Structures are given as structure tokens and as C-alpha cells.
């Protein structure tokens, strides 16, 4: 019926300790999604081509030229960590647990309301009247078989809101069309012209135009109807909530000290290098900590800002996130730069249109690479090497003195063992879909939980078309009574975690909330102001260090 | 490694009336896909609105 409710608001997180040190976290999230009517009722193939950027010589990284199919459907996409958990829950989980794993996901749509707007004068200046449409419906389809392309709204920072008391909106669904884009590489104010800035026609071999009407089972929902998509059971791998510190010079047995320090200030000299036991791979007749044989390489070097190009334009190749070293440079190890809005964590007192940005420096301290202090010697090791026997991060590669050997050096090999990148709080992404290729990547840097079997079916909502009395199908007018709707979305994400074990003598690192000041973890960020302007800055995921080897 | 086929195999002689039949070898391979891909690294994920 139209006057009875068909669900319950629930937002609590329930921890349940089951078994020998395993907690069952039951995160719940309920929001009021505000579905507006689509811009047009047609599937349109729109093309973006920023010639004002790419026409300037040197702007190949500023390219975002593409084509997209813009669907009239909106996406209820909930894979971000801030949707389900409050910051106290994330702090308790990251301090108290040792690993996290996803179990299951229930989703629900209830309390549907559709309203149409009208005009009245009342003063000579017309105002809107929001009547009620008890017979108009909204269309819901869950793509549980993943026919349609997988577009996460965590890519565009367009998921559900992170504050439960504020109503949120649904992101519009659109996917990529496969047309060819070619851009000619050129540097800043180079003499000459840009040879290639073209974009191609649709190709007959690879063109996929999907409609959501021909591919899905669409449920109509009036004001008394509810929708519930049942328990999708995850088949992911656990992520670890502890971080590592051991580099390649901190693996194995330390060398035994020949002399010991008398006071608390001086050091202890080891056995001299020429008469020291151990194994190396160089041909010198001495063993040292730098050239000692290790079990495996912990972090690999990766090429800095390599812009590859294959039938779509120049794109930067993704780097595995690692720690920024004492050599503070963040671009080499691939620290992800997040840019989010007021719905997702920006302080609401920011009147400017610029977003809130944050560089996520990784806490995997053994996998980080120091680029200024990396060097390559000649094939027989003769230290100290001459000038022509060493390649450092000062020598020009090719002829370019702005580019050194670290920009092109890839040292990913068979004995390379790196760590999985940490989940990012609120403006993260929980899960992903595995790429449909025969040889998969070892990891996704967008999400820690890549679904092995099938991703959860993405939810697509739209409003049913409300027509006026005048409707010509062969006339492109579409009068279309101005309707909108609000509905309630409730989801349940089940997770399984393990409790932390305390082996170290010293007090280990913890994420504590500090007092009001210039510190990063002051409480006044996580408290509303006098006008209620909340703010969510990210939290450290991996406070507690763990032993690699 | 000098291999001879006489010292290593079981050799069947076949005259004009004889037949040979080697039985069902059952494969244990992985499937190949008869569909091709088009998505580059600039066509993955959600397009910008």
C-alpha cells in the first residue's frame, strides 16, 4: 500500500567474536538516495576532445579525449570504506585486528517516493509545488552476471555519501566506447607542429553498444514496493592490517659483532670484511652488508612516469604503491593522489570549487626505493669505481639531462616479493572486478579485494518515464512531466577479521586521536562545527608493524 | 644426449595386414578464448561525467 513503510533504517556495526580469535564485523549502511530524472531518455554516444589542452605542445599528460555511451540509468555504487564504517570503527579495526577479509553483501531498496513539480504564482513570482505521484514507478536492475561494463563510482569519487545523516545522490552510469585516439609526443614550445591529434570513427570489429533494457531484468517499484538483492558471497583474499619495515638489508642473520660497545653511545665493530664468513654474488674477496646474498628482493624499481600509448592515447603506466624513502620523492613509488568532494570528506566550510586533495604515502617501509641513492656499477665489482664505471642518478640518459637511469630502470624479477597496498579510509574502494584476460595482474592498485569469481552485481536505478497527454513517437519533443524520487538504500557488508597478537616488548604504534592543534589527528576534524560542518580526512590503515622474515 | 629410438621405445612392426592404434590421450589444457578484446588502459573503469 501507499501509506505503510517497507523497511527499517539501520546503520550499526556489530562485532562478533567467533572461534579462536576471529571477529565477525557486520557493517550496515542506510542512505536516502535522491534520484532525479535523466537529462534525456536516449542512449547517446558522446565524444570528449580537449583540443585546447592537447593543441599546446607538451600536454600529452593533460589528455582526456575519449568517447562514452551515456545511459539514462543511475548507479547506486557503494564500494568505498566510508559508506559502511565510522572513523571510530576504522580506528578500532586497524588497531585491534591483524587482517581483514570480505564475506558477504546484502542490498535493499525500500521506502520509494516519487514526486512531480508544478508552478503557482502566489505573488506574481512563480514558485514550485511538489505534489505526489502514487502511480509512477522507478526501475531497478542488478547486473549480477556483469554483462554491462564495470564502472566503479569510486573512480570518479561518486559513490554513496559517507555521513549517514545526510541524503545523497546516485551517480549516472556511462561506459567507454572503443574508438582510436592518436597523439604525437612533443615537448614544451618545440619548433614544429603537433602531427597527430586525431580521433577515429567507430570500428566494425570492436564496437559494443549495451542497453540496460535488453540485458537485465528490470523491477518496477512504486511507493509500496520494495527490492532486495540477496547475499552475494565474496571469494576474495585477505588483506593484512599490519605493515612491514624490513628492507633488503634487514633480512636474515645479522653479522656477529667482534667488539661490543662499552657505553650507550658508541657502536660495535664487526669482523673485518676481508676475513669475514658468508656468501656474496660479486667476485671480491670480502663480504659486506651491501653485497651479501639475500633470499629475495623486497622492493622493485619501477619506471617513473612512463606514458605508454596503444590505440587509445597516452596513459601513465600504473605503479605498485610503496613507501617514500628518506629521499622524500613520492612520484617514484606511486603514492596515490586522491581528489574528493564535500560528500566524501572535504570540509564543508570550503567555499571554493577546488576539491580536497591528499597524497597517500604508503607504509610499506621495506619496499620503498630511494632514487637519488641508487646506482649501478660495472660487471666486475671494483669499489671505489671510476667515473666511467658507475651510473648514478645524475647522468643523462639519451641526451636528456632531466632524465636519469631510474626513470627507465625496471627491476621486477622472479625473486621479487613486495607487499599488498593498504586500503585507504573513507575515499577508498573496497572491491574490484578481475580483468577478463587470460593472464591476470597479480594485484589491483584501486582495490585490495579483487573478486576471484564474479564481482557483486552493480545496481542501476532510473525513473520511469512520465508522459504528458501530447506524445508523438515520430516527433523528437518528449514533453515529459518533471518528476523526481527519493528512496532508501540499506546494505549489509559482512567482514571477518583476526585479533592482533602482542609479541614485542615495547609499546607498538597506535592510531590515537590527539587534542585540538596543528596535528593531523586532532579531534576537531572528526567533530561537527557550530553550523555542523563535518569532515573526513583519511586514517592510517596499518599502524602495527609486523616482521617480514 | 644421444637418444636412439630403438633403445627407448616399443616398436610395432606392421605388414600389409596389420594395423596400429594408439588410444585416447586425454588432454589437460586450459581453454583459449574465441573473442577478442579492445579496451586499452585508457578505457578501464568509469568514464568522467
Amino acid at each position: 500500500g501507499v501509506g505503510v513503510s517497507t523497511g527499517s533504517y539501520d546503520n550499526q556495526t556489530h562485532y562478533r567474536a567467533l572461534g579462536d580469535g576471529w571477529v565477525e564485523i557486520t557493517a550496515l549502511a542506510t542512505r536516502l538516495v535522491h534520484l532525479n530524472m535523466p537529462k534525456s531518455e536516449n542512449y547517446c554516444r558522446i565524444r570528449v576532445h580537449n583540443t585546447t589542452d592537447t593543441s599546446v605542445k607538451g600536454n600529452m599528460a593533460k589528455d582526456d579525449a575519449h568517447e562514452q555511451i551515456w545511459t539514462p540509468w543511475s548507479l547506486v555504487d557503494a564500494n568505498a570504506w566510508g559508506v559502511w564504517l565510522q572513523p571510530s570503527d576504522w580506528q578500532y579495526i586497524c588497531n585491534t585486528m591483524s587482517q581483514l577479509n570480505l564475506v558477504s553483501l546484502d542490498q535493499e531498496i525500500f521506502n520509494v517516493v516519487l514526486k512531480t513539480v508544478t508552478e503557482q504564482d502566489l505573488g506574481g513570482q512563480a514558485i514550485k509545488i511538489y505534489n505526489n505521484d502514487l502511480t509512477a514507478c522507478m526501475m531497478v536492475a542488478v547486473d549480477s552476471n556483469n554483462i554491462l561494463p564495470y564502472t566503479p563510482a569510486a573512480n570518479s569519487m561518486e559513490t554513496l555519501g559517507f555521513y549517514p545523516w545526510k541524503p545523497t545522490i546516485a551517480s549516472p552510469y556511462r561506459y567507454y566506447f572503443c574508438v582510436d585516439r592518436d597523439l604525437s609526443v612533443t615537448y614544451e614550445n618545440q619548433e614544429g607542429t603537433v602531427e597527430h591529434n586525431v580521433m577515429g570513427t567507430p570500428k566494425g570489429m570492436n564496437s559494443q553498444f549495451f542497453t540496460i533494457e535488453n540485458t537485465q531484468q528490470i523491477t518496477l517499484l512504486r511507493t509500496g514496493d520494495e527490492f532486495a538483492t540477496g547475499t552475494y558471497y565474496f571469494d576474495t583474499n585477505p588483506v593484512k592490517l599490519t605493515h612491514t619495515w624490513q628492507t633488503n638489508r634487514q633480512l636474515g642473520q645479522p653479522p656477529l659483532l667482534s667488539t661490543f660497545p662499552e657505553a650507550d653511545t658508541d657502536a660495535g665493530t664487526l669482523t673485518a670484511q676481508g676475513s669475514r664468513h658468508g656468501t656474496t654474488q660479486m667476485g671480491v674477496n670480502w663480504v659486506s652488508e651491501a653485497i651479501r646474498t639475500r633470499p629475495a628482493q623486497v622492493g622493485f624499481c619501477q619506471p617513473h612516469n612512463d606514458f605508454e600509448a596503444s590505440r587509445a592515447g597516452p596513459f601513465a603506466a600504473p605503479k605498485v604503491p610503496a613507501d617514500i624513502t628518506q629521499g622524500v620523492d613520492k612520484e617514484a613509488n606511486g603514492s596515490v593522489r586522491y581528489s574528493y568532494g564535500k560528500q566524501h570528506g572535504e570540509n564543508w566550510a570550503s567555499h571554493g570549487p577546488a576539491p580536497e586533495r591528499y597524497t597517500w604515502d604508503e607504509t610499506s617501509f621495506g619496499s620503498g626505493r630511494d632514487t637519488k641513492d641508487g646506482f649501478i656499477q660495472s660487471a666486475p665489482l671494483v669499489v671505489p669505481p671510476p667515473l666511467n664505471g658507475i651510473l648514478t642518478n645524475a647522468n643523462p640518459i639519451g641526451t636528456k639531462n632531466d632524465i636519469h637511469f631510474s626513470n627507465v630502470f625496471n627491476s621486477y624479477g622472479p625473486l621479487t616479493a613486495f607487499s599488498h597496498p593498504s586500503p585507504v579510509y573513507p575515499q577508498g574502494q573496497i572491491w574490484d572486478k578481475e580483468l577478463d584476460l587470460e593472464h591476470k595482474p597479480r594485484l589491483h592498485i584501486t582495490a585490495p579485494f579483487v573478486c576471484k569469481n564474479n564481482a557483486p552485481g552493480q545496481m542501476l536505478v532510473r525513473l520511469g518515464p512520465n508522459l504528458t497527454d501530447q506524445y508523438d513517437p515520430n516527433g523528437a519533443t518528449l514533453s515529459r512531466i518533471v518528476t523526481y524520487g527519493t528512496f532508501f538504500w540499506k546494505g549489509k557488508l559482512t567482514m571477518r577479521a583476526k585479533l592482533r597478537a602482542n609479541t614485542t616488548w615495547n609499546p607498538v604504534y597506535q592510531v590515537s586521536a590527539e587534542d585540538n592543534g596543528n596535528s593531523y589527528m586532532s579531534v576537531t576534524k572528526w567533530l561537527p562545527t557550530a553550523t555542523g560542518n563535518m569532515q573526513s580526512v583519511p586514517l592510517i590503515t596499518r599502524p602495527v608493524a609486523r616482521n617480514t622474515y
Side-chain angles (χ1 to χ4, degrees), chain A residues 114-313:
Chain A
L114 279 83
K115 289 184 164 172
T116 80
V117 314
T118 318
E119 300 279 325
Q120 296 255 304
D121 275 347
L122 170 140
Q125 303 281 72
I127 57 166
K128 295 186 182 72
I129 308 300
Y130 316 100
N131 285 120
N132 213 346
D133 215 331
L134 300 173
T135 59
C137 75
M138 61 166 285
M139 303 155 74
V140 172
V142 162
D143 190 24
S144 53
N145 293 136
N146 280 297
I147 309 296
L148 263 52
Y150 199 82
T151 81
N155 297 154
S156 285
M157 293 283 125
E158 286 185 319
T159 170
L160 279 307
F162 297 156
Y163 319 102
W165 51 92
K166 283 289 180 176
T168 182
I169 63 175
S171 90
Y173 183 68
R174 71 274 193 191
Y175 56 94
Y176 271 124
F177 207 78
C178 282
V179 307
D180 298 335
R181 204 257 186 274
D182 205 295
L183 181 49
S184 87
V185 193
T186 173
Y187 55 89
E188 187 183 342
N189 57 21
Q190 179 204 48
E191 290 183 354
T193 186
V194 174
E195 181 217 339
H196 292 162
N197 213 331
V198 309
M199 198 173 331
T201 334
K203 297 163 72 77
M205 208 149 176
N206 43 3
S207 293
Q208 286 178 113
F209 164 60
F210 296 106
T211 81
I212 318 194
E213 277 88 356
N214 295 290
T215 40
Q216 316 295 143
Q217 214 165 15
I218 292 161
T219 296
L220 316 168
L221 296 186
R222 288 175 155 175
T223 46
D225 278 86
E226 51 163 319
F227 175 77
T229 180
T231 323
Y232 163 75
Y233 285 100
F234 283 91
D235 204 19
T236 66
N237 268 329
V239 81
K240 290 187 181 71
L241 296 177
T242 44
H243 77 90
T244 53
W245 60 271
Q246 269 179 345
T247 65
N248 214 16
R249 279 197 41 185
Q250 277 140 8
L251 300 170
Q253 189 171 10
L256 77 161
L257 283 85
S258 198
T259 81
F260 286 86
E262 283 318 312
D264 271 297
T265 60
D266 42 358
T269 70
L270 308 170
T271 295
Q273 297 191 346
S275 88
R276 196 190 298 188
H277 303 339
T279 172
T280 44
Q281 265 175 343
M282 325 290 185
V284 287
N285 279 359
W286 40 268
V287 181
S288 88
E289 278 286 275
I291 63 163
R292 204 153 68 101
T293 317
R294 291 293 196 261
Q297 201 189 1
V298 172
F300 68 102
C301 299
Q302 38 205 353
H304 313 154
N305 295 21
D306 49 348
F307 285 88
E308 313 190 316
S310 81
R311 228 178 263 276

Side-chain angles (χ1 to χ4, degrees), chain A residues 299-465:
Chain A
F300 68 102
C301 299
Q302 38 205 353
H304 313 154
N305 295 21
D306 49 348
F307 285 88
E308 313 190 316
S310 81
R311 228 178 263 276
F315 64 98
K319 287 164 289 292
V320 182
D323 180 50
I324 71 164
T325 41
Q326 317 96 351
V328 199
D329 60 352
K330 303 181 180 181
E331 313 259 27
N333 298 272
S335 315
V336 195
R337 179 66 179 260
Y338 290 87
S339 315
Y340 48 94
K342 287 187 182 180
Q343 200 162 64
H344 303 280
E346 183 182 1
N347 186 39
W348 298 358
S350 289
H351 282 77
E356 183 75 33
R357 317 186 185 274
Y358 176 76
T359 305
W360 175 262
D361 301 337
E362 192 68 28
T363 47
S364 85
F365 297 93
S367 317
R369 274 302 157 275
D370 207 347
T371 50
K372 295 97 162 193
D373 295 318
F375 68 103
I376 279 179
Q377 298 202 7
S378 44
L381 187 72
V382 285
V383 74
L387 177 48
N388 306 274
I390 186 171
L391 191 66
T392 62
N393 194 68
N395 301 149
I397 294 312
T399 57
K400 297 300 179 70
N401 41 5
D402 40 344
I403 289 145
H404 314 282
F405 88 102
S406 310
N407 305 119
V408 304
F409 187 64
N410 192 2
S411 53
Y412 177 78
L415 39 84
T416 288
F418 61 97
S419 195
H420 211 260
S422 64
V424 175
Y425 201 38
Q427 46 262 3
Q429 167 170 356
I430 313 179
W431 56 80
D432 216 336
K433 192 176 89 71
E434 186 60 60
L435 298 198
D436 200 305
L437 292 178
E438 290 80 47
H439 307 291
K440 328 272 198 180
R442 291 224 290 177
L443 74 157
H444 286 202
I445 68 170
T446 58
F449 291 94
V450 198
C451 293
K452 285 189 235 160
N453 43 2
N454 281 316
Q458 54 189 356
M459 185 172 297
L460 296 145
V461 293
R462 72 164 290 180
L463 294 165

